Amino acid sequence: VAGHASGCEEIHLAGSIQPHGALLVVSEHDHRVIQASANAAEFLNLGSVLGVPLAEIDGDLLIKILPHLDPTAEGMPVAVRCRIGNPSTEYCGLMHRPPEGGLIIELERAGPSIDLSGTLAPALERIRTAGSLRALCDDTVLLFQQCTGYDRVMVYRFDEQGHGLVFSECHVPGLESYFGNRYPSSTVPQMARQLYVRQRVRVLVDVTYQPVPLEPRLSPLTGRDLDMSGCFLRSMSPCHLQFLKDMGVRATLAVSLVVGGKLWGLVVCHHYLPRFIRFELRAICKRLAERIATRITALES
Ligand SMILES: *[C]C1(*)(*)(*)=C(*)(*)(*)(C(*)(*)C2(*)(*)(*)=N(*)(*)C(*)(*)(*)(=O*)C(*)(*)(*)([C])C2(*)(*)(*)[C@@](*)(*)=C(*)*)N(*)(*)C(*)(*)(*)(C(*)(*)C2(*)(*)(*)=C(*)(*)(*)(C(*)(*)C(*)(*)C(*)(*)(*)(O*)=O*)C(*)(*)(*)([C]*)=C(*)(*)(*)(C(*)(*)C3(*)(*)(*)=N(*)(*)C(*)(*)(*)(=O*)C(*)(*)(*)(C(*)(*)=[C]*)=C3(*)(*)(*)[C]*)N2(*)*)=C1(*)(*)(*)C(*)(*)C(*)(*)C(*)(*)(*)(O*)=O*
Ligand SMILES: [Cl-]
Ligand SMILES: [Cl-]
Questions:
Q1: Peptide bond into 211 cis (omega under 30)
Q2: For ligand 1, what atom is nearest to the CA of residue 196?
Q3: CATH number for the domain including 104?
Q4: CA dist list (Å): 265 to 137, 163, 166, 167, 199
Q5: For residue 275, how far is its CA from the centre of ligand 1 (angstroms)?
Q6: What range defines the domain where residue 52 resides?
Q7: Which residues does 113 contact at the CB level (< 8 Å), separation at least 6?
Q8: What values do phi and psi take at 267, rounded to 5?
Q9: 3-state secondary structure 15-68
């Protein structure tokens, strides 16, 4: 198709995911899958997925999520551990409910317990006793690097006009240093900063990925695009991916620092090969970011 009609987006309405997980959307009157990422049946080792009742999916997903489905104030979002498919694989399933559109379950392959409590006790002490923002942010990048193994870790700070600053940095020997560089606010646009106040960790596994569309794209329950604000698998803005490609970065982890309800900064990690961190380690990063934000609050008071 050509002609005139043929031929800086609402990032939370991406309609697609990154390929290192599967996404199911479930209607809760009948507990059937009403949307799924196009890769779901392959990824989960299932013959079919769309339209299938959870009870009929090979494995124990339904039994595992049942205890968390009734309304509760201390409930979702919540992660469960289950087995799915034939051949059966273990998964971690992250569940949340968008405002409308049903119940979202995002599934990643499970791995072993991560045993970082002995690293964490002293990390927490270093955080709670940091005497300045300089000290705190320097310790932050070191701690994150140790925990996560990324080739570069930065604290990226926002000012009141939204401009960005690389306030702290560590990196593997021999790499480029971005320490102290400034960037325009347009590089992390307002709608993205607002999203990051609600969705506190983002992982981009491979910047060169091909997005995996939701099928159907539009929610059967709303007739609108699915609100993917809370989706950890959400596909990321092409404009941002191009930015990272032009720097040669292959993978990223970002963790929000939220102070007084505002996005104060990000812990931003780069890797020069594809990289994924699983749910348990993401949870630790989030706990660390809350501890750091508490200390920023005190230091700024
Ligand atoms: C839509 C969107 C953009 C847009 C965008 N970036 C640009 O460079 C231009 C001016 C414009 C359009 C192309 N940027 C971002 C996100 C973004 C983040 C947050 C990433 C994350 O994983 O949470 C960050 C940290 C940056 C900028 C940088 N990252 C770096 O490491 C460095 C420098 C060392 C910079 C400057 N941009 C989005 C939203 C992406 C999404 O879908 O969540
Ligand atoms: Cl529903
Ligand atoms: Cl079951």
A1: no
A2: 23
A3: 3.30.450.20
A4: 11, 11, 10, 9, 13
A5: 18
A6: 16-109
A7: 280
A8: -90, 120
A9: CEECCCCEEEEEECCCCEEEEEECCHHHHHCCCCCCCCEHHHCCECHHHHHHHH
